[model samples]
Structures are given as structure tokens and as C-alpha cells.
Target: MISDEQLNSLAITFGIVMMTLIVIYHAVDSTMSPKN
Candidate 1:
């Protein structure tokens, strides 16, 4: 069984990874988007 501390650590790591990916994805998307 996992402890609360472990769960919190995992959650924090996952959040950081997800946020980073989201930022990169949007940045690339904007760069590739068609200009007016």
C-alpha cells in the first residue's frame, strides 16, 4: 500500500510534467498556426 506522502509526491511530479508538456504544446502550436 502507498502512503499519503508518496501519493503527494507522485501527484506533484505528474502535475509538473503535465504542465510542462501543455506549455510546450501550446507554444509549438502557436508557432505553427496560420498567420492572418
Candidate 2:
């Protein structure tokens, strides 16, 4: 769901970025199993 409506575009940016961080976390978690 890529919703970009100018003003709420900021919201979209934050949402995608936050989810990207989560993805990085899980990706690294799966690639390496250790206390990060």
C-alpha cells in the first residue's frame, strides 16, 4: 500500500522507513544469530 498524498507523504516516508528498519533487523537476525 503505497499511499502518497503530499501532506501525508511524510507519513508514508516514515512508515516505509520504519518498516525498512524492521526488515533490516530481521534480515540481520536471520543472517546472524547473536546479540546485536
Candidate 3:
């Protein structure tokens, strides 16, 4: 079984990865459609 500390670490890593992916996805979308 995993310890609490390890679980917290994994959670933080997952959050960071998700945030990065979201930022990248938004950037691509914005680039595809120019705003007025």
C-alpha cells in the first residue's frame, strides 16, 4: 500500500501535469482562432 506522503506527491504531480496540458491546449485553440 502507498503512504500518505507518497499519495500527496502523486496528487501534486498529477495536478501540475493537468495544468500544463490545459495551458497548452488553450494556446493551440487560441492560435487556431484569432480574436477581434
Report every candidate's CA lDDT.
0.71, 0.73, 0.71
Candidate 3, poorest ten consecutive residues by summed lDDT: 1-10
Q: Which regions of candidate 2 deviate over 4 angstroms?
A: 1-9, 30-36
Clashes by residue pair, model 3: none
Task: Compare candidates 2 and 3 on TM-score and give the better one.
Answer: 3
Candidate 3's C-alpha runs over 4 A off are 1-10, 31-36
TM-score to native of every candidate shown = 0.43, 0.39, 0.43
Error of 3 at 28 (Å): 1.1
RMSD of candidates 1 onward, in order? 5.7, 5.2, 5.0
lDDT of candidate 1 over 1-36, digit per residue (tens): 355455776667788998878778877876643346
Q: After superposition, how far is residue 14 of candidate 3 from its true place, in Å?
A: 0.6
1 versus 2: better lDDT goes to? 2
Mind sharing the TM-score for model 3?
0.43
Q: Write the per-residue lDDT of candidate 3 for residues 1-36, one digit (tens) a residue.
A: 355455776668788998877778887866543356
